[PDB]
Paper text:
Protein arginine methyltransferase (PRMT) 5 is an essential arginine methyltransferase responsible for the majority of cellular symmetric dimethyl-arginine marks. Previous structural analysis revealed that [name] forms a hetero-octamer with its obligate binding partner MEP50/[name].
We were further able to build a six amino acid stretch of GRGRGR for the C-terminal tail of SmD1. We also find that the canonical methylation motif [name] is placed in the active site of [name], providing a secondary binding site. We also observed density for sinefungin. While the amino group of sinefungin is positioned differently than that of dehydrosinefungin (A9145C), this may be attributed to differences in structural determination, where, compared to X-ray crystallography, cryo-EM can sample different native conformational states of SAM analogs bound to [name]. Adenosine and MTA lack this terminal acid tail, thus providing a structural basis for how SAM positions the double E loop to catalyze substrate methylation.
Numbering used by the authors:
A (entry chain M): 109 to 114
B (entry chain J): 13 to 174, 180 to 637
The structure:
């Protein structure tokens, strides 16, 4: 999960 | 490439009309399924016995054309909320018939008008239709920006003209509420001859707008006779193009000396001359309003393909290198450069990016350093071992342990560690750093030196619908509202500017350390709007003037590592202009887990969300 999430 | 369609009321033959519309360059055609003037009866005896086909057969087009090119429009003569019993009954029957036929065709979207103060019975019929059968058509509620009664000319002697600027939105909201925020009801914003205040447009852009209807009468005439939008309609069209709404050009050709395609062409021009996306936006494409659960490295190990995305950001590590450079310059004077060896401890070295940054900073600063890279995820420890054996060599010592359970051989002159999330302490950075302090030199420093988290109310029916769609079985049905989600807010409206809460500083050497926090925030409100949750950002000071931030007004250029966080609330909170939203946040811990509780109090007291971490906790 790109960004800061799954 | 902007996707736009055509709206028509006269369709003598479907095939020819579709051919001509496609030739002009449109993508889809909004037409009436039944002839608009063909009134039908269902109760009266002599009339209801009408022989012959009601509407043109569905065999006229292929099964694919209906699903991609046609948008059904409700007949104008239907008025469910009429005040005459017979008219209302006939309207209900006809609307149900038309919706059923549209579903039978397979129409991607169906247009329904909202041009009245009351739409309760229409909402009831629509809700009945949505919950019956296995159809999937979307419904677009054509609602104007300015009510018809307000934009009419002042040419009546018996009735001169003139919160009144927002009444149209109130029509939508109520209707939405009657349908219970159904995922299948969108808005077809019908632009007007003149725009309202900026606040009205801002509130509207937070709604689930799927299409925007442009009358041909809006366009002005340029010097060569071609249609052109006004200077403010231009900005509004740009703002809509930030979203992915579809443009429906309606009306007739008010510029007879030019081909109708011009109306489309100009739109395309605005699409092609739109300001280019920046690096951050290009990075974020594909995850707008895509709810994701936060990462909890302290308990769950990451995978290599997450460190990969973590490494793509060049801003974060450049800032860290600058901070290390400045700190090393400050601590070591020039005369002691030869022999003063500073000890740096990276906590959570990952796959070695921060180790490389630290080594580069020391190299450019001309100061010698010893390096200890701590890491718990054994998979990352394998990569760190390979890095150390091949290239770093003796200068770097890799340790496979938790910094809270590690016994360092010597105290650290500098500590470097990034353990922040969307919310600054979302990732339990304070808990790990406070434990790590026990091997930090008395005059040593820690990077980041400080971080604060800011909170701001937001309004987004889209995000509320996603949160509701996160309904998973085998758990409390309300649990989806009691946990935060990391997501890129795109289709949302900000009610007020963010305010700080839960500041943290390192190293914290007060007599007794406590990481539990409680904050009360008061946000002024300027427009009648519905609060759906609170968005959280974070800012941080690494060393002196070196900083990172994702707060909207001080976002670091191009730093796309972190997305905002979203704390939802179970029930939307309606707020009026001049009121104050009073939210309260608690950061609680019990030496085994950590959680966040939040409650709204001023507008209308809401329940305390996520009590005792029953719905969301971070392992400690
Ligand atoms: N309490 C802890 N003890 C040891 N390692 C930890 C602890 N909490 C988090 N970590 C590690 O810290 C690391 C976080 C970083 N790798 C994240 C990206 C960072 N830019 C890097 O590439 O190093 C992960 O490997 C976690 O396993």
């Amino acid at each position: 999960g790109r960004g800061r999430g799954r | 490439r902007v996707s736009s369609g055509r709206d028509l009321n006269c369709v003598p033959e479907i095939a020819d009309t579709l051919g001509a519309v496609a030739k002009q360059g449109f993508d889809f055609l909004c037409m009436p399924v039944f002839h608009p003037r063909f009134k039908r009866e269902f109760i009266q005896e002599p009339a209801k016995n009408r022989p012959g086909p009601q509407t043109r057969s569905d065999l006229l087009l292929s099964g694919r054309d209906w699903n991609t090119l046609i948008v059904g429009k409700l007949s104008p003569w239907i008025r469910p909320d009429s005040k005459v019993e017979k008219i209302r009954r006939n309207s209900e029957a006809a609307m149900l018939q038309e919706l059923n036929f549209g579903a039978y065709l397979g129409l991607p979207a169906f247009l329904l008008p909202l041009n009245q103060e009351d739409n309760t019975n229409l909402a009831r019929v629509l809700t009945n239709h949505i919950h019956t059968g296995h159809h999937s058509s979307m419904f677009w509620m054509r609602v104007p920006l300015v009510a018809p009664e307000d934009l009419r000319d002042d040419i009546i002697e018996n009735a001169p003209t003139t919160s009144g600027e927002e009444k149209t939105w109130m029509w939508w909201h109520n209707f939405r509420t009657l349908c219970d925020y159904s995922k299948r009801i969108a808005v077809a914003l019908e632009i007007g001859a003149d725009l309202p205040s900026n606040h009205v447009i801002d509130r509207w852009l937070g709604e689930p707008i799927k299409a925007a209807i442009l009358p041909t009468s809006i366009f002005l005439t340029n010097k060569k006779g071609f249609p052109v939008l006004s200077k403010m309609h231009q900005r509004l069209i740009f703002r809509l193009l930030k979203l992915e709404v579809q443009f429906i050009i309606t009306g007739t050709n008010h510029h007879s000396e030019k081909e109708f395609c011009s109306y489309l062409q100009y739109l395309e021009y605005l699409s092609q001359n739109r300001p280019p996306p920046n690096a951050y936006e290009l990075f974020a494409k594909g995850y707008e309003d895509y709810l994701q659960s936060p990462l909890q490295p302290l308990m769950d190990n990451l995978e290599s393909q997450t460190y990969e995305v973590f490494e793509k950001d060049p801003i974060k590590y450049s800032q860290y290198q600058q901070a290390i450079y400045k700190c090393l310059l400050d601590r070591v004077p020039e005369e002691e450069k030869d022999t003063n060896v500073q000890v740096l401890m990276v906590l959570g070295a990952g796959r070695g990016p921060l180790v490389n940054a630290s080594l580069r900073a020391a190299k450019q600063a001309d100061r010698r350093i010893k390096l200890y890279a701590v890491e718990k995820n054994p998979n990352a420890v394998v990569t760190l071992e390979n890095w150390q054996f091949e290239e770093w060599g003796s200068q770097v010592t890799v340790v496979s342990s938790d910094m809270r359970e590690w016994v360092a051989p010597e105290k650290a002159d500098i500590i470097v560690s990034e353990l922040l999330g969307s919310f600054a302490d979302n990732e339990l950075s304070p808990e790990c750093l406070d434990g790590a302090q026990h091997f930090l030199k008395d005059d040593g420093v820690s990077i980041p030196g400080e971080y604060t988290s800011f909170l701001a109310p937001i309004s987004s029916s889209k995000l509320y619908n996603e949160v509701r769609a996160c309904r998973e079985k085998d758990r409390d049905p309300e649990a989806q509202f009691e946990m935060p989600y990391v997501v890129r807010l795109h289709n949302f409206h900000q009610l007020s500017a963010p305010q700080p809460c839960f500041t943290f500083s390192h190293p914290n050497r007060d007599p007794m350390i406590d990481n539990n926090r409680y904050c009360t925030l008061e946000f002024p409100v300027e427009v009648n709007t519905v609060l759906h949750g609170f968005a959280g950002y974070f800012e941080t000071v690494l060393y002196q003037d070196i900083t990172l931030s994702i707060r909207p007004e001080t976002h670091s250029p191009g730093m796309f590592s972190w997305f905002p966080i979203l704390f939802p609330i179970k029930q939307p909170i309606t707020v009026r202009e001049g009121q104050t939203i009073c939210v309260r946040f608690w950061r609680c811990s019990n030496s085994k887990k950590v959680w966040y509780e939040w409650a709204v109090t001023a507008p209308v007291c809401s329940a305390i969300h996520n009590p005792t971490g029953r719905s969301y906790t971070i392992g400690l």
